[PDB]
Amino acid sequence: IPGVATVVERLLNNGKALSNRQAQ
Amino acid sequence: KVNFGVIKLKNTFVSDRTYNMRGEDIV
Amino acid sequence: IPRFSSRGQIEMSLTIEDGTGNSQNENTSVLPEVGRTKISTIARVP
């Protein structure tokens, strides 16, 4: 079971853009 | 432009699972 | 491995083994001696 730190850091990876939003 | 989202699965597990069939392993 | 599901149902992945070990004057007649049973499955319950 991975940790929140590992999961989130791997999420914020290899993306070239801006202007983000959040989806439930 | 970009979206970060959380999706809550209900009826299934998320991690891949493995089952033994006495010779024919199933993933 | 338990978890929840729609309408508050509980889904579970189960591996169960249970039972006795064979050990032969009415001794076996008194003791449980229920054999051995293993079941591996997955099910959900309201």
From Swiss-Prot, chain B:
Q: Which domain of life is it from?
A: Bacteria
Cell compartments where the protein resides = Cell outer membrane
In the UniProt record for this chain, what is stated about the effect of gene disruption? Inactivated mutant strain is unable to invade HeLa cells and to provoke keratoconjunctivitis in guinea-pigs.
Q: Which family does it belong to?
A: Belongs to the bacterial secretin family. T3SS SctC subfamily.
Question: Can you state the subunit structure given in the record?
Answer: The core secretion machinery of the T3SS is composed of approximately 20 different proteins, including cytoplasmic components, a base, an export apparatus and a needle. This subunit is part of the base, which anchors the injectisome in the bacterial cell envelope. Forms a stable homooligomeric complex. Interacts with the pilotin MxiM/SctG and the inner membrane ring outer protein MxiJ/SctJ.
**Role, per record:** Component of the type III secretion system (T3SS), also called injectisome, which is used to inject bacterial effector proteins into eukaryotic host cells. Forms a ring-shaped multimeric structure with an apparent central pore in the outer membrane. Necessary for the secretion of Ipa invasins.
What is the protein named? Type 3 secretion system secretin
Q: Which organism is this entry from?
A: Shigella flexneri
What would be the name of the gene that encodes this protein? sctC
